[PDB]
């Protein structure tokens, strides 16, 4: 729904095609009619609301930290993730442990506000799956 905005309708089909497929866990999957809906418009609303405030709640030492780690450490995850970012020793501008611990505590709330929209009400907690893979025991149901 984010790509569908602000872009040509013919371009949307190129994105819906690669996104409707899901090759997760061996078996392939596909999404029937992912029509845009007002139910998405409110789902996009809570995500767009979280999309902004987390940038405000983020500490100056937090968002900067990924750009600074590349100066010394190097790793596979550091390189593959760095390409997604825009292209652009030194003292911290300020360090206030009480002010900084407060910035993080508020930051967790918006994450739960944002993470939950992809989360679902968990219902099962399977233990020992049957060998046939046609049945399994469950707990926490409801």
């Amino acid at each position: 729904g984010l790509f569908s905005l602000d872009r040509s309708y013919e371009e949307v089909k190129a994105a819906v095609q690669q996104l409707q497929t899901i090759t997760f866990r061996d078996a392939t999957f596909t999404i029937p009619d992912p029509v845009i809906d007002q139910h998405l418009l409110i789902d996009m609303k809570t995500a767009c609301l979280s999309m902004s405030m987390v940038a405000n709640l983020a500490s100056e030492l937090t968002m900067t930290y990924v750009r600074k780690l590349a100066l010394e450490d190097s790793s596979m995850l550091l390189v593959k993730c760095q390409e997604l970012l825009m292209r652009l020793p030194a003292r911290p501008q300020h360090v206030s442990p009480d002010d900084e611990i407060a910035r993080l505590s508020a930051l967790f709330v918006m994450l739960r506000q944002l993470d939950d929209l992809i989360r679902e009400q968990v219902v099962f907690t399977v233990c020992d799956v049957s060998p046939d893979n046609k049945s399994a025991t469950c707990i926490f149901k409801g």
Binding site: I42, M53, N56, L57, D99, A102, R103, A106, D116, L117, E120, Q121
Partner: protein, 48 residues
């Protein structure tokens, strides 16, 4: 501004799922939701 008042409510509802519950909750409480972002823009270096 001067003070953040508590606003207690008891709210029975047939809804049980957390996703469906919070969504309808934003209609009745949209005004207080507007107050939250408003406190942020007015007060840099303050994080309610």
């Amino acid at each position: 501004g001067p003070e953040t008042r508590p606003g207690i409510y008891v709210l029975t509802s047939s809804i049980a799922h957390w996703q469906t519950l919070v969504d309808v909750a934003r209609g009745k409480f949209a005004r207080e939701r507007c107050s939250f972002v408003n406190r942020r823009i007015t007060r840099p270096r303050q994080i309610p």
